[PDB]
Design a protein around this ligand. Structure first.
Ligand SMILES: [Ca+2]
Lengths: 17, 89
């Protein structure tokens, strides 16, 4: 219930220049 | 009955734990000892694409609080992930 897909996409990895 | 959640946690490999340890960190980003209390958890919601209130956030903590402390830890937090493993209901 923690948006497993939106969990890493939002934080825990968001470096994009 | 048995413990389908407490059993999976102990049966977790470095491949899974390495992922949970990630949120557990951002979940307590600013904590004093290393737990959660919505103040830090909600901080992630805004990024997760949502934003629960402090009165309801407790639900994310009371769902795995078997110690009556109010804050979550690597013990209660981990289970919070096994309960939401995959959706198939
Ligand atoms: Ca607790």
């Amino acid at each position: 219930r923690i948006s497993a897909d939106a969990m890493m996409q939002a934080l825990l990895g968001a470096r994009a220049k | 009955m048995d413990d389908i959640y407490k059993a999976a946690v102990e049966q977790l490999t470095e491949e899974q734990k390495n992922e949970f340890k990630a949120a557990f960190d951002i979940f307590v980003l600013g904590a004093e000892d290393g737990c959660i209390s919505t103040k830090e958890l909600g901080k992630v919601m805004r990024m997760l694409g949502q934003n629960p209130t402090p009165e309801e956030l407790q639900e994310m903590i009371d769902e795995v609080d078997e110690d009556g402390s109010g804050t979550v830890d690597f013990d209660e937090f981990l289970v919070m992930m096994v309960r939401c493993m995959k959706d198939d209901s």
